């Protein structure tokens, strides 16, 4: 975010400002995060309550995403949520019962389950069958 | 699982009486300088 009012820095909407910041604007695209969270949160696994999303901002900010949240599908409104979240450090529900989006203290490990398998997506790494790995992985553990 | 909408403001501002009080403090600080 940056005061112009605070606006989520965007790859296309803002170009000169990020140049003044000196940051390569190629890596200034939050829409990827918006779509990924959109495809994630709308997945049936969330509807089954078996998923939690964590967002690690490039600056080093860790955000916990409650499975109940619903981001706006429109990107413009999504930016409004992010600037609201980053400055207030928390987002409250319309009914005011739970904090859907909360910034949390690093490292990530403490929040993760005690027994959990960690993996990353690597294009150079061996190509696997996602289904097969999940069955051979143990039950009590998490991925 | 339950679904609840997130609450937020369209534009974030980081009522009038506080604004009046805020202007007073700025005026206090300047007038003190002019006197000194």
């Amino acid at each position: 975010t940056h005061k112009i009012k605070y606006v989520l820095l965007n790859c296309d909407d803002h170009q000169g400002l990020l140049k003044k910041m000196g940051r390569d604007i190629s890596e200034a695209r939050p829409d990827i995060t918006h779509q990924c969270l959109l495809t994630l949160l709308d997945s049936p696994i969330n509807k089954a309550g078996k998923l939690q999303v964590y967002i690690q901002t490039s600056r080093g900010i860790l955000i916990e995403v409650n499975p109940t949240v619903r981001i706006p599908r429109t990107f413009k409104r999504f930016s409004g949520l992010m600037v609201q979240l980053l400055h207030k450090l928390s987002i409250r529900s319309v009914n005011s019962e739970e904090k859907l989006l909360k910034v949390i203290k690093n490292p990530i490990t403490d929040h993760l389950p005690t027994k959990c398998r960690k993996v990353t997506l690597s294009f150079d790494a061996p190509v696997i069958r996602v289904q097969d790995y999940i069955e051979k992985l143990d039950d009590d553990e998490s991925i | 699982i339950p679904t609840h909408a997130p609450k937020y403001e369209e534009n974030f501002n980081p009522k009038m009486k506080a604004q009046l009080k805020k202007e007073r403090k700025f005026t206090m600080k300047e007038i003190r300088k002019d006197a000194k």
């Binding site: 619903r70 706006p72 599908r73 429109t74 409104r77 | 679904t3 909408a5 997130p6």
Partner: peptide, 11 residues
């Protein structure tokens, strides 16, 4: 109850 591809209300 919102469902599917609904967007949150805009006021």
């Amino acid at each position: 109850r919102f469902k599917g591809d609904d967007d949150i209300p805009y006021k």
